[PDB]
């Protein structure tokens, strides 16, 4: 049979390329095929649309995102192929093999051969496609792993009816270039252009936002009798275009990031829709100026600390960025962008005593505040396992940036700016 081509916009080369490598004849389709495209390039959507356009094809869908490692990857292949073969040919009497016995790729080959032997009595050769979306997204991955999937078809009995025609999708490009010499038929996906992203989001989210409860509540509240779905779509498109033109430099030509801004700002934008803003998007934009001037992607006196805690933090920041050379020069009566350095506990205590406003000394409250600072992730250590503060090999460093310590000093009225 002849494959029918889908009408996916902004991909009208790859949808034609897929008709080249996928066909009803298993003697034509290659044993491997890789589709390459970064996140949000439409690979999964395009491939799923192509398969849904030609139901006569036979496929298995798995996601290494869910399948953490390679052993589940093989086990799911075996189990899903078994289920699919039962579903496609219930009439043929067949037996079962345990999909949980697959421990090595050879065992996968063995189980697949054993299953395919059962279906030897099939009338014609069958073309089967195994689809792994995001092959390089596997959490435990190595270079030698992918080679095991390229040269696997030829270990099967070549006279068998069931032929496995693997399909892979890849995100990165440093991954695919390692396998260039294999000359695997590869189809490519570039990043969508700004106009393409703008058109796609309008095509996608318009119907999603035309039927939300908030707008149809606000229409009732505002008694908009002349509101129509055509104008509803126009309002949604104006919203999307405004977000795109305001935040393309912030998000890039990325579909996922813009979708979430469209979701977040949508209630607040709706709150400003009134009787006067039905026909003038300019006035609505003017009313919504403060919504556009801020991304609002933020999750939201920034750090409530005791005076001892504040002075300890002030001293620690000096320790982590001032050379040990200058301690006696500055504090005894006798750089903004680099990563902080380590410091010892005695240096911190000495600088704290020197800067605390007759001696303050070190009581239990001082060390308690110091430990609170560590617990609050304001001071970092040089250890990650079996935390033991009293071990004489652990050093300290500051995790608080300049913008916060500036305001802390302002609240303390301590002039750090003159020490550098």
């Amino acid at each position: 049979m002849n494959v029918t081509t889908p009408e996916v916009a902004f991909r009208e080369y790859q949808t034609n390329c897929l008709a080249s490598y996928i066909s009803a004849d298993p003697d034509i389709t290659p044993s491997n095929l890789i589709l390459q495209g970064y996140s949000g390039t439409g690979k999964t959507y395009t491939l799923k649309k192509y398969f849904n356009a030609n139901p006569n094809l036979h496929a298995v869908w798995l996601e290494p995102v869910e399948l953490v490692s390679w052993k589940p990857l093989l086990q799911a292949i075996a189990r899903t192929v078994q289920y699919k073969l039962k579903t496609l040919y219930p009439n043929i009497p067949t037996t079962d093999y345990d999909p949980l016995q697959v421990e090595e790729p050879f065992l996968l080959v063995k189980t697949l051969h054993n299953i395919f032997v059962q279906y030897e009595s099939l009338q014609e050769k069958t073309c089967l496609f195994l689809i792994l979306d995001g092959f390089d997204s596997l959490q435990d991955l190595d270079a030698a792993l992918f080679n095991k999937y390229i040269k696997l078809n030829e270990l099967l009995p070549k006279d068998s009816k069931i032929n496995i025609k693997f399909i892979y999708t890849m995100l990165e490009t440093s991954f695919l270039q390692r396998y260039s010499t294999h000359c695997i038929p590869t189809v490519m996906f570039p990043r969508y252009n700004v106009d393409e992203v703008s058109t796609i989001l309008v095509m996608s989210r318009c119907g999603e936002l035309m039927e939300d409860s908030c707008l149809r509540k606000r229409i009732i509240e505002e008694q908009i009798t002349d509101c129509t779905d055509d104008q509803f779509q126009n309002v949604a498109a104006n919203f999307i275009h405004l977000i795109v033109q305001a935040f393309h430099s912030y998000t890039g030509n990325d579909i996922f990031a813009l979708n979430d801004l469209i979701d977040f700002k949508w209630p607040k934008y709706v709150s400003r829709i009134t009787k006067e803003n039905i026909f003038e998007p300019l006035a609505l934009y003017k009313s919504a100026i403060k919504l556009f001037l801020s991304t609002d992607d933020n999750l939201s006196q920034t750090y409530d600390l005791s005076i001892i805690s504040k002075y300890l933090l002030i001293a620690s920041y000096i320790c982590s960025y001032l050379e040990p050379r200058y301690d006696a020069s500055i504090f005894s009566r006798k750089p903004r962008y680099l990563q902080p350095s380590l410091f010892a506990i005695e240096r911190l205590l000495a600088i704290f005593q020197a800067i605390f406003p007759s001696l303050m000394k070190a009581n239990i409250e001082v060390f308690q505040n110091l430990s609170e600072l560590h617990t609050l992730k304001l001071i970092a250590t040089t250890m990650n396992k079996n935390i033991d503060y009293l071990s004489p090999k652990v050093r300290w460093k500051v995790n608080v940036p300049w913008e916060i310590i500036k305001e802390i000093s302002e609240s303390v009225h301590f002039n750090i700016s003159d020490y550098f």
Binding site: P185, Y250, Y337
Partner: protein, 106 residues
């Protein structure tokens, strides 16, 4: 025109299956003999295939970035250039961004 592609392919790399990997799309994409007679002669589709093969290298990724992304990239590259080790961090990139915007406004 077709022999032009053949010679260029030969002079670039001499693995025949690699050239077959490009010829096959041309044949499969062909819809009918009448259109095939026109398509096979000029053979403009191999250029499209070749550019697709290169669409995800450094140039293809650089062509799609926005103005802000490109400016931050330029600033980070400047920081790396002024660095003996060629390394940079976010703070230095943003400081160079601030300085370049101040200069542009000034």
């Amino acid at each position: 025109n077709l022999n032009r592609h053949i010679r260029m392919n030969f002079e670039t790399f001499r693995s025949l299956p690699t050239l077959k990997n490009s010829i096959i799309p041309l044949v499969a994409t062909s819809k009918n003999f009448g259109s095939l007679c026109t398509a096979i002669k000029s053979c403009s589709f191999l250029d499209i295939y070749n550019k697709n093969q290169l669409s995800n290298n450094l140039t293809g990724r650089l062509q799609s970035l926005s103005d802000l992304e490109l400016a931050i990239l330029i600033s980070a590259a400047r920081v790396a250039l002024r660095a003996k080790d060629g390394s940079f961090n976010f703070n230095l990139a943003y400081a160079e961004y601030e300085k370049m915007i101040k200069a542009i406004n000034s």
